[PDB]
């Protein structure tokens, strides 16, 4: 008991009570402190500018909470640490993914032999400030399969009104943490529980494009790793072109991790080729690049120039980045086994679809064959032949219906034999009469379509508001055709 | 609602007017639902951006 | 006002979310002057939480309702049980069948 | 084969497959698409033949492959049927693998190292592999590559032009 | 305070090694954790973090004892079950199998 009381008094005393980290209030300072320390992401920058401005304008300092979400390795966690350095409050972070019991967030009852106060209390014990920038991360995949959700305790943690007097177990005291600045990360919003999802502001970090991905590579990756490994600019010059080649072939992803790791190995093998190697000044060159990384991990960009009858390029907003899934369909049996009969040619759907996509596909079929007879009564190719169909898996479930537009264009193309025009994406749902529908997550889609050399994107007309939010360079080349009624798509798709 | 947010953010009525037409325009165009919550988010957003525009 | 002493009661609110259902309760508490104390029960499945434990287990603590009574130090607050519809109901022991022993008007007195 | 080939000389009824081997789902997926592509290649290639169009057919694919790698075997099936279709013993000791698409465009598959080392001792001499996987075949220890001939391809119609000269 | 309250295992290793730069070798990390306290890994991370361990301080001896010159190492069968906060502090290296014509070379040599 004496030892437990020793621990308990020491814990209760260690907690700051009124300690308040000072808060810098130079707009001109934070501007540069951010812009020189991270690239892009104007909106988060602007938001924190908003926050500072509110607190300085609104007298005394205040806490808040926020929720970033985006593709992995996009800098989500490093910006947070930089922001903590910028705002002058102390920093801390801790994983939450896959945990079930709240005891780590809630300590223990302290009569147990192994009890210790919950981790946030450790952060208070280290972070002397009573208003640290806590950074919970990857809340979207918090472990919740066990009976009793930790997420309820999480909502108990977040909601400000009871944030004022939150109650930990190891010590029985309510504790205000309204001053504390939570932040949280997720690769997809939907998995997070609704009561918590509705409580918080959302922000979406986007995927960087090659042109800008380069400039960050040559400002914050190469210098950083070079200082990490002790090499100096006198030893390891890397022309931008080899970095381009690393991007073009050896890495293909929206994030900045795999390129990070591969650049690390290159620099490492360079340093090894200095510690004993003949050269005292590495200068990687594209021919020389093989020596450090071996043969390319990618060579094709797209799987081939489209076969005219029965395939179509399809954007899809997969859980990790955008992607260019191709829809593919084919004949299943000789067409004219009985010219005079009347038994309509069945579909075969494939692709491990969930049910909603399956009916969506069937609906698309119905509308397609409707339109086919509608404007081309004489044709019968699609009413009197079996067909098998495949939409490759990978799309986030919400995006499944969006394939339908392409799907229609699939059958009709095969029904006509006409090649689709080269490198011409499209997406979105249909509504059984050719009216086209809004779809989410346009940003990553346009990203990947730019990455695949597409030039003539076709989109629901309604969602144009977002396409004009893109950065001026991202729009370069691409020729959007806004449209709403699918009959337009039949015009542009087949001139 | 608006006065509450305005007190929440320290601004006073002299600093950030909101003509009613803009408000009806928001509810009719920029967010639709039986609940007002999302509209509450919108109004705070405009206020807080206005605050930055002041400071 | 016609019969002196204070009385208790149970009530339900329902409609689309965000109609103010939570906040107005606090307004009522400030009006009548009863104490306020929110308490969500969405998805709860530890029925013992509402009824404590045998007191011979290590780590036992009395159930929530005594904790809130200890907080308000007053016989007649206004609890705000929230989101009862989503209460956990599984094989591990459904608390909702234990709530009836609170919620029943006559028998709550003991 | 599983039923007489002319039980309905004019019958418009499918040559139903009857797969066996304790299949998983993804293998059913890959099997079905392989069935269809086979039927397509045959109509494009030997239009007069219709043995697969109208012949109920039992098929057996033994279990044991790692489940993620299970689609990789599809290409083998695609020739299996074709051999039986066209009545041609398959060419000797000519193993092949890799996933395929509806146009007969082979796709990369993993675990080449285990595959190569196991097939090496079977006496195989003429492997054929996706050209899209070829670099990994230029990373294995040289002694493994000595002996067996190797091919590389992207469109399966070439593979059909190797196995059956 | 406990009878026989010897310092934890690392101190014994420091005794056995009689030098400040051992090649300490943590082992079978993959399935550590999930104890009665949840895990001691936090303290291990305090060891791993150079500024914290630079004045590492056991319960048994009041003096902090620097261990910067230790060359810690880790091993685990697969890089999934390790708790993440330590995982980011370390690097991973995949280990392959052995060739049958070389497994014999081991069989003969050892
Ligand atoms: N805008 C950026 N500025 C500086 N570094 C960046 C940026 N974007 C990505 N990074 C780099 O990406 C790497 C990992 O980024 P970060 O951890 O912040 O990504 P992340 O999205 O948090 O990944 P995850 O959430 O999946 O951990 C860091 O080493 C970081 O240097
Ligand atoms: N009639 C109303 N008067 C005042 N506020 C309202 C009204 N209807 C909705 N609200 C607002 O709706 C928000 C949600 O309130 P609350 O009752 O806390 O949530 P819930 O809707 O889940 O009960 C509050 O910010 C509140 O101001
Ligand atoms: Mg991170």
SS3 of chain A: the string is: CHHHHHHHHHHHHHCCCCCCCCCCCCHHHHHHHHHCCCCCCHHHHHHHHHHHHHHHHCCCCCCEECEEECCCCCCHHHHHHHHHHHHCCCECCEECECCCCCHHHHCCCCCCCCCCCCHHHHHHHHCCCCCCECCEECHHHECCCCCCCHHHHHHHHHCHHHHCCEECCCCCCEECCCCCEECCCCCCHHHCCHHHHCCCCEEECCCCCHHHHHHHHHHHHHHHHHHHCCCCCCCEEECHHHHHHHHHHHCCCCCCCHHHHHHHHHHHHHHHHHHCCCCCCEEECCCCCHHHHCCCCCCCCCCCCCCCCCEEEEEECECCCCEEEEEEEEECCCCCCCCCCCCCCCEECCCCCCHHHHHHHHHHHHHHHHHHHHHCCCCCCCCCCCEEEECCCCECHHHHHHHHHHHHHHHHHHHHCCCCCCCCCECCCECCCCEECCCCCHHHHHHHHHHCCCCCCEEEHHHHHHHCCCCCCCCCCCCCEEECEHHHHHHHHCC
Cα distance between residue A24 and residue D91, in whole Å: 78
* Resolution of the model in angstroms: 5.6
Which among A288, A326, A302 is positioned nearest to A451, based on CA atoms?
Answer: A302
Q: What are phi and psi of D3, to 5 degrees?
A: -145, 160
Which class for A124: exposed (0-12), middle (13-18), buried (19 or more C-beta within 10 A)? buried
- Residue with CA closest to ligand 1 atom 4: A38
The angle at the Cα of A130, spanning A126 to A135, to the nearest 5 degrees, equals 70
To the question of whether residue A205 is assigned a binding role by annotation, the answer is no
* Distance in angstroms (rounded) separating the CA atoms of residues A474 and A42: 15
- Subunit contact B9:A56, Cβ cutoff 8 A: no
Nearest CB partner across the interface for E36, out of A94, A113, A119: A113
| Matching residue, tokens 């022993």 | C101
Centroid of ligand 1 to alpha carbon of A75 (angstroms): 2
C3 burial via Cβ count (<10 Å: 0-12, 13-18, 19+): exposed
- Paired strand residues for A435: A485
Contacts of D8 (CB under 8 A, 6+ apart): D54
The residue whose two tokens read 């730069």 is E21
Report the alpha-carbon distance of residue A195 to residue D55 in Å, rounded.
58
**Closest ligand 2 atom, residue B40 Cα:** 25
3-state secondary structure of E91: coil
Token digits of residue E4: 């026989």
Interface test with B, best of C18, C22, C23 (most B CBs within 10 A): C18
Cα four-point dihedral sign A279, A284, A290, A292: positive
Torsion of the alpha carbons at A109, A112, A115 and A118, rounded to the nearest 10: -20
Q: Compute CA E95 distance to the chain's CA centroid, rounded to the nearest angstrom.
A: 19
Gap between the Cα atoms of A133 and A83, Å rounded: 9
Residue A434 to residue C54: CA distance in whole angstroms: 67
Sign of CA dihedral A356, A362, A367, A371: positive
Residue E69: CB atoms within 10 Å: 9
A200: Cβ contacts below 8 Å, ≥ 6 apart: A65, A66, A67, A158, A184
> A74 C-alpha to center of ligand 3: Å?
8
E36 by Cβ neighbours in 10 Å (0-12 / 13-18 / 19+) ranks as exposed
Residue A179 in contact with residue A61, Cβ under 8 Å? yes
- Nearest in space to B55 (alpha carbons), one of D150, A28, C39: A28
Torsion over CA of D50, D55, D60 and D65, rounded to 10 degrees? 40
Distance from CA of A154 to the nearest CA of E (A): 18
Instruction: For residue D127, give the DSSP letter.
Output: E
CA A100 to chain CA centroid, nearest Å: 25
Of the candidates E49, E103, E98, E95, which has an alpha carbon nearest to the alpha carbon of residue E76? E95
Quick one: DSSP state of residue D91? Answer: P
- A323 DSSP β-pair partners: A316
Q: Which of A438, A443, A432, A388 is nearest to A410 (CA)?
A: A388
Q: State the Cα torsion D129-D131-D136-D139 to the nearest 10°.
A: 100
Output DSSP code: residue C6: -
Looking at the complex, report in whole angstroms how far the Cα of residue A98 sits from the nearest Cα belonging to chain E: 10
Positive or negative, the CA dihedral A395, A397, A399, A404 is positive
Name every chain E residue with its beta carbon within 8 A of the beta carbon of A94: 85
Question: Bridge partners of D127?
Answer: D150
Neighbour count for residue D119 (Cβ, 10 Å): 17
Residues of C in contact with A195 (CB under 8 A): 40, 42, 83
CA atoms of A349 and A358, how far apart (whole Å):
7
State how far the Cα of A182 lies from the Cα of A94, in Å rounded to an integer: 11
Q: Are D18 and D56 spatial neighbours (Cβ–Cβ below 8 Å)? A: yes
Q: In Å, how far are A148, B3, B22, B27, B44 from B17, measured between CA atoms?
A: 47, 11, 10, 17, 13
List the single best residue of A148, A154, A165 to mutate versus C (max C Cβ within 10 A).
Answer: A148
DSSP single-letter state for residue D96: B
**Which B-chain residues 5-44 have CB contacts (< 8 A) with chain A?**
9-11, 37, 41
What is the C-alpha separation between C77 and C8, in angstroms, rounded? 10
Residues 6+ apart with CB under 8 A from A18: A130
Q: How far apart are CA A54 and CA B52, in angstroms?
A: 7
Nearest one of C1, D108, A104 to E36, comparing CA atoms:
A104
**How many CB pairs below 8 Å do chains A and E form together?**
20
E70: tokens are 């230790």
Contact between residue D70 and residue D109 where contact means Cβ atoms under 8 Å apart: no
**Hey, whose CA ends up nearest to atom 14 of ligand 1?**
A73
Considering the candidates D83, D105, D113, D115, report the single residue annotated as catalytic: D115
Helix (H) or strand (E) holding C36: strand C36-40
CB A16 within 8 A of CB A128: yes
The answer to whether A104 contacts E42, with C-beta atoms less than 8 Å apart, is no
- Under a CB-based contact definition with an 8 Å cutoff, are residues A100 and A144 in contact? yes
Backbone angles phi, psi at C84, to 5 degrees: -60, -25
How far apart, in whole angstroms, are the C-alpha atoms of residue A218 and residue A208? 14
Phi, psi of A456 (to 5 degrees): -135, 50
Pocket test for ligand 2, best of C12, C19, C38, C85 (most atoms within 8 A of CB): C19
Write the CB contacts of C4 (distance below 8 Å, at least 6 apart in sequence).
none
Please identify, by atom number, the ligand 1 atom nearest to the C-alpha of residue A80: 18
Q: How far is residue A417's CA from residue A426's CA, in Å, rounded to a whole number?
A: 19
C19 vs B contacts (CB less than 8 Å): 34-36
Contacts of residue D47, defined as CB under 8 A and 6 or more positions apart, other chains included, come to none
């Amino acid at each position: 008991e004496f030892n437990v009381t020793r621990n308990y008094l020491d814990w209760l005393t260690s907690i700051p009570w009124g300690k308040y980290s000072n808060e810098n209030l130079d707009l001109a300072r934070a501007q540069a402190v951010l812009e020189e320390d991270h690239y892009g992401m104007e909106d988060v920058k602007k938001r924190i500018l908003e926050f500072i401005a509110v607190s300085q304008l609104r007298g005394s300092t205040q806490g808040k909470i926020l929720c970033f979400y985006g593709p992995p390795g996009v800098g989500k966690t490093s910006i947070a640490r930089s922001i903590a350095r910028a705002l002058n409050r102390e920093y801390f972070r801790f994983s939450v993914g896959g945990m079930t019991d709240v005891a780590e967030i809630k300590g223990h009852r302290r009569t147990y032999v192994g009890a210790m106060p919950g981790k946030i209390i450790q952060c208070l014990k280290k972070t002397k400030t009573e208003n640290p920038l806590i950074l919970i991360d990857e809340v979207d995949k918090i472990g919740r399969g066990y009976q009793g959700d930790p997420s309820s305790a999480l909502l108990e943690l977040l909601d400000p009104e009871q944030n004022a007097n939150f109650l930990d177990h190891y010590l029985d005291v309510p504790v205000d943490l309204s001053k504390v600045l939570f932040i949280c990360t997720a690769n997809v919003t939907d998995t997070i529980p609704e009561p918590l999802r509705d409580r918080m502001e959302m922000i979406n970090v986007s995927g960087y494009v090659a042109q800008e991905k380069l400039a960050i590579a040559e400002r914050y990756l190469v210098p950083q790793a070079r200082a990490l490994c002790g090499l100096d600019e006198s030893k390891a010059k890397l022309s931008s072109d080899v970095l381009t080649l690393l991007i073009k072939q050896y890495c293909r992803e929206s994030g900045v991790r795999n390129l990070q790791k591969q650049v690390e190995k290159v620099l490492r093998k360079s340093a090894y080729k200095i510690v004993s190697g003949e050269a005292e000044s590495v200068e990687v060159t594209p021919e020389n690049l093989q020596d450090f990384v071996g043969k390319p991990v990618f060579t094709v960009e797209r799987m081939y120039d489209v076969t005219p009858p029965g395939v179509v390029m399809g954007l899809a907003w997969t859980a990790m980045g955008g992607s260019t899934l191709f829809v593919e369909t084919s004949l299943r049996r000789p067409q004219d086994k009985d010219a005079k009969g009347d038994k309509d040619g069945s579909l075969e759907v494939t692709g491990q679809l969930g049910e909603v996509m399956k009916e969506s596909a069937r609906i698309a079929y119905t509308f397609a064959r409707a339109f086919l007879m509608q404007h081309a009564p004489a044709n019968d190719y699609l009413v009197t032949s079996h067909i098998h169909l495949h939409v490759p898996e990978g799309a986030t479930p919400k995006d499944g219906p969006s394939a339908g537009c392409t799907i229609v264009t699939a059958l009709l193309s095969l029904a006509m034999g006409r090649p689709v025009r080269q490198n011409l994406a499209m997406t979105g749902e249909v509504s059984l009469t050719g009216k086209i529908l809004p779809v989410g997550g346009i940003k990553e889609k346009t990203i990947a379509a730019k990455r695949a050399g597409v030039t003539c994107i076709v989109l629901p007309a309604e969602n144009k508001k977002d396409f004009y939010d893109l950065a001026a360079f991202i729009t370069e080349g691409l020729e959007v055709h806004f449209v709403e009624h699918y009959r337009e798509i039949f015009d542009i798709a087949f001139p």
